Amino acid sequence: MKPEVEQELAHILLTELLAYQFASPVRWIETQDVFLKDFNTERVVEIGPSPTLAGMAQRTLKNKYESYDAALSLHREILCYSKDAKEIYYTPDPSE
Amino acid sequence: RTTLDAEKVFTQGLNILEWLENPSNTPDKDYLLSIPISCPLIGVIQLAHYVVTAKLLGFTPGELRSYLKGATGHSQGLVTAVAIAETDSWESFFVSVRKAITVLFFIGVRCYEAYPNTSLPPSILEDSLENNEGVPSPMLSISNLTQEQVQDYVNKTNSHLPAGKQVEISLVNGAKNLVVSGPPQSLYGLNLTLRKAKAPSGLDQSRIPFSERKLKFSNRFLPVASPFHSHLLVPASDLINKDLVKNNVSFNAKDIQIPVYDTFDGSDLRVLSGSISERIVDCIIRLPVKWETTTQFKATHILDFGPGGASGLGVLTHRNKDGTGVRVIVA
Amino acid sequence: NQRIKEMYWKLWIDEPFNLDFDPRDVIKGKDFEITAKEVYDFTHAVGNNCEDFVSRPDRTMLAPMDFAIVVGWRAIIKAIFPNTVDGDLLKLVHLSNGYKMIPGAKPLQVGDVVSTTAVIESVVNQPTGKIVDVVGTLSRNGKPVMEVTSSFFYRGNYTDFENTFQKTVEPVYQMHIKTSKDIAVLRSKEWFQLDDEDFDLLNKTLTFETETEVTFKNANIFSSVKCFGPIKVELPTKETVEIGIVDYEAGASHGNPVVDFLKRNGSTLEQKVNLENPIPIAVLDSYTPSTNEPYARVSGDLNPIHVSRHFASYANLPGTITHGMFSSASVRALIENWAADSVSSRVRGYTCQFVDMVLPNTALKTSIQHVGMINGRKLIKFETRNEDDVVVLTGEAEIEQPVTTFVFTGQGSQEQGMGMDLYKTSKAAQDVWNRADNHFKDTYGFSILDIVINNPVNLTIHFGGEKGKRIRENYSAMIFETIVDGKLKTEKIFKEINEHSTSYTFRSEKGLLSATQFTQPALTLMEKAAFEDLKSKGLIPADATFAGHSLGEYAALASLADVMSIESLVEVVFYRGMTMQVAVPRDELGRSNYGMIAINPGRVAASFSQEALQYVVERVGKRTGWLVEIVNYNVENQQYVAAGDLRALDTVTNVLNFIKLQKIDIIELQKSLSLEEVEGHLFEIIDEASKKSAVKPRPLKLERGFACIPLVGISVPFHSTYLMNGVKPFKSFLKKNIIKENVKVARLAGKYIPNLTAKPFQVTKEYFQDVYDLTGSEPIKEIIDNWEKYEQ
């Protein structure tokens, strides 16, 4: 597949994914499992005015990732842009 | 000198006479604790305690071992147990000494080569330390849980890990005293599952009904460099036995003058129809220790020649047998 | 010098001794097969106990970054041997050495077969000696993997400027072209050469990516000066694109007049961004070995000064000094352990300044800090001192952040004044908000900033004068592009606004910031602004996964794949919100018989699963005949959101309150008590809540119910099939406002997680299939059918 065609197709794909998204359900359960299990994300950063997707991550972790995170010695960090600026920008306060 | 790639393991030599003379010339505790040097040298400590014990009683080694109903060892103590059984006069002592410490040497060298201990991610170390667990190592001790209880927690922890990183129950020292071996990182993942189920050790549930209280138990890592009695060491068994063949070491039932109790069975190693050397290796490298059933003999007195005085195998055995008329002496 | 080189050549190079080759020429090093044994011997020599480099059941053994010097040394060191670079090798000094991984390349493995190329970038006669900057490139499978750089110094007095040349890679210079005078000045310069003469430079941002090659007449005067590289224009997407070339050439100069011009008239872009304060990581002790032989064996560096008293003594050294390249690998091993938590793959760059020599058996304190960021990699600085507290090694490393996923928040979270603290303090954020505010003011006659800042209850747009009629056209030209009976048809979003309208007024009960048409762009900007600020501090990992909840999908796509300009993003999201507003009859005042509730199946009964809720709702829908659906699957057995007919939400919210008070366990009185016939018992509980809600205040209020919270009066049934009407036109609009050329497949593939298919974006027949399976899309189907687009 040529780059030009890959783009032309990626376009049509993106277009349709957003078009139907409008009037289909939002599969945030599976989405969370993709980035939590399949990608083993150690830093989930919510870009938003309030930590509502962060709140959801913490809960999905507490439910079905208790033993998984333990066994894989997998420290995880849920951050929201509005709540935890200092952690995201790596600027801890004058405490050393 | 004799053994092919031996020096590649003994990175800071093994000039033990220099270490004892000039403390300032002793390697760091990490080097000393790694099995290629600690295995043989523990054997030397036990053999030495056996000697002072004999010499002060005015006995020869054989005279001492004649007074024994039997003998056995925990983990790599099994080696110096069978070596003691063959013992006789002083003139023929150093042949038994040779036999023991050349077994322990190859166990060390081959079991290190099989699973050498690598850099521990500092994050994991800092965490285990601040939670009063140990310095992560390949063997993890667990007070106050049933064998079948511990086995649940390993099954769960193991369910998410591939073959190479699985952990298994290594030792069954008592009813509610177990040890688990595997990669230090895998045993950390166990400790994490464990930290959740355990209650703070000063919780005070004195006003909660017994039935509804939460489990209180210890789990600290052990000071050992290698995961004894685990699948990680299996590859070494074959090679170790070939090294004993090549260095003219084996143990013929005919020579061993007291029963020497098998670490997994409780059986006598004399009754075996295989090679004894091979079973002793297999008992240390791969098979668990069922210390309770190993120690199933009847006797009024037990002598712990083994390292660690009051932290030693002696006192553990005493706690198992308290109230049955057995006296343990830390030799 | 020749006799000395002959001996050194016999020690370092397994080839015929020939000094008669060009420094200019590239140097090819022998192909090299990395093996278990070599890696083991090397890691033991430098004292690197990282697990990644040790033989373990069912895991391919990596090789340390450092191993590049074993592979490369023969090619790299050969560079300092030609007759035209005539040095006393016994007065040679290693100044520095670095490795940098090329992006996307995996680190060295034990399988790999690696070859090395080495060029000599610069040879200049400093007054104190002759400096030789060398650049290696390790390739595997005819692909670059990492670049080695090493700098050597021949101490002495050198006049041979005819054998001196220097190439430097200039920092990228940026220029905002404002005035027609600015452009006149640029055309003045011969070296400014556009692809297209007639290119409109006005109000564009040019970048100048420039290399300068120079030759020397003496210490001061250059014999020749070359300065070339592409000139690029910034697009609305922030993508820079070639529009021409810098091409300066000159004989005897005292300077480079291109860099002088760009320095004074442009700002220099910096890749490295310092933190507010350095974060300490650790101070660590390490030792140099008692013997340098072990390193020499594994490295091929049989330089006698490291092993032989008599050579060291001849070279005026303090002793048989430790190999520089040992200290390199040894300190690097520490950084790998403490700064990268012993994940070798994370460290993608390491540089190394040999500040002074170290003897065998020296004790080294090395302190390490997190000092800055660069393209989402932590910039680590370090310093290494000896017992006498003398600095001996300095340098820096670039270390990947742990695996990161960005999630972008949907509607409902928005608050007055949001993002405005950032707007004050951040250039990056200002530019986003302003680009967008200007777009809205100029095309629709309102300020998105005003709406975010003051959240007005009403806002009226005035169509007075030539500027006002242009704005009114844009309100009328807002259409639905449906294709019915073969031919195209047009439908006006704003029915009230005609050729005779002097004004139009937006209304809302409590504040326009929570009317979806403003909410969506407002929220999108808050997020995109925050993201661009983060990106400007180099805080965004290159390989980050991302997803957005509902509306967040649009912000996420723009924030991480710059799929749309700020102008396109807010334009699309505004149209989207307007589509949603038309689809709901609100024909009494600002209210509809459509809304949504947040359900917690846990609270009805711990046994009431996802299947249970999906089934209970599917039944109310089919039986009552009123549309209701689960539109958000948020948190398993804890947070779902259903939307549809307000009557059908009133049945569900009560039916659940009945199943809770009934206190029934699903799994027991499921297939065991009643098989399928349960549906008979369900309809019984639906019909007794259904006709209770089939007569109320007709725009009926929705109440709470143990499990079910009504969402802060949201008038619209988002993500319900009700909006399936708006898909065909919105799609036609998305195609017009998301241009194909702006979709970089690399920035989406395996990172973008949509809401339709909770599966990482791939341009694969399997994906197109999965899409079709939840869509019926005709354009998608015909693509699957002809997946033989592999042929040109």
From Swiss-Prot, chain A:
Phosphoserine modification, residue list: S50
Location in chain, cross-link Glycyl lysine isopeptide (Lys-Gly) (interchain with G-Cter in ubiquitin): K37
Modification after translation (UniProt): 4'-phosphopantetheine is transferred from CoA to a specific serine of the Acyl carrier domain by the C-terminal PPT domain. This modification is essential for activity because fatty acids are bound in thioester linkage to the sulfhydryl of the prosthetic group.
Family the entry assigns: Belongs to the thiolase-like superfamily. Fungal fatty acid synthetase subunit alpha family.
Complex formation: [Alpha(6)beta(6)] hexamers of two multifunctional subunits (alpha and beta).
Misc. comment: Present with 17000 molecules/cell in log phase SD medium.
Function: Fatty acid synthetase catalyzes the formation of long-chain fatty acids from acetyl-CoA, malonyl-CoA and NADPH. The alpha subunit contains domains for: acyl carrier protein, 3-oxoacyl-[acyl-carrier-protein] reductase, and 3-oxoacyl-[acyl-carrier-protein] synthase. This subunit coordinates the binding of the six beta subunits to the enzyme complex.
Protein's name in the database: Fatty acid synthase subunit alpha
Annotated source species: Saccharomyces cerevisiae (strain ATCC 204508 / S288c)
Curated annotation (Swiss-Prot), chain C:
Positions of region (Dehydratase): 1-368
Domain named MaoC-like: residues: 265-390
Region Malonyl/palmitoyl transferase: start-end pairs: 369-587
Chain positions of cross-link Glycyl lysine isopeptide (Lys-Gly) (interchain with G-Cter in ubiquitin): K106
Active site annotation, chain numbering: S550 (for malonyltransferase activity)
Chain's role: Fatty acid synthetase catalyzes the formation of long-chain fatty acids from acetyl-CoA, malonyl-CoA and NADPH. The beta subunit contains domains for: [acyl-carrier-protein] acetyltransferase and malonyltransferase, S-acyl fatty acid synthase thioesterase, enoyl-[acyl-carrier-protein] reductase, and 3-hydroxypalmitoyl-[acyl-carrier-protein] dehydratase.
Protein family (similarity comment): Belongs to the fungal fatty acid synthetase subunit beta family.
Additional record remark: Present with 91800 molecules/cell in log phase SD medium.
Name the record gives this protein: Fatty acid synthase subunit beta
Species assigned in the record: Saccharomyces cerevisiae (strain ATCC 204508 / S288c) (Baker's yeast)
Gene from which the chain derives: FAS1
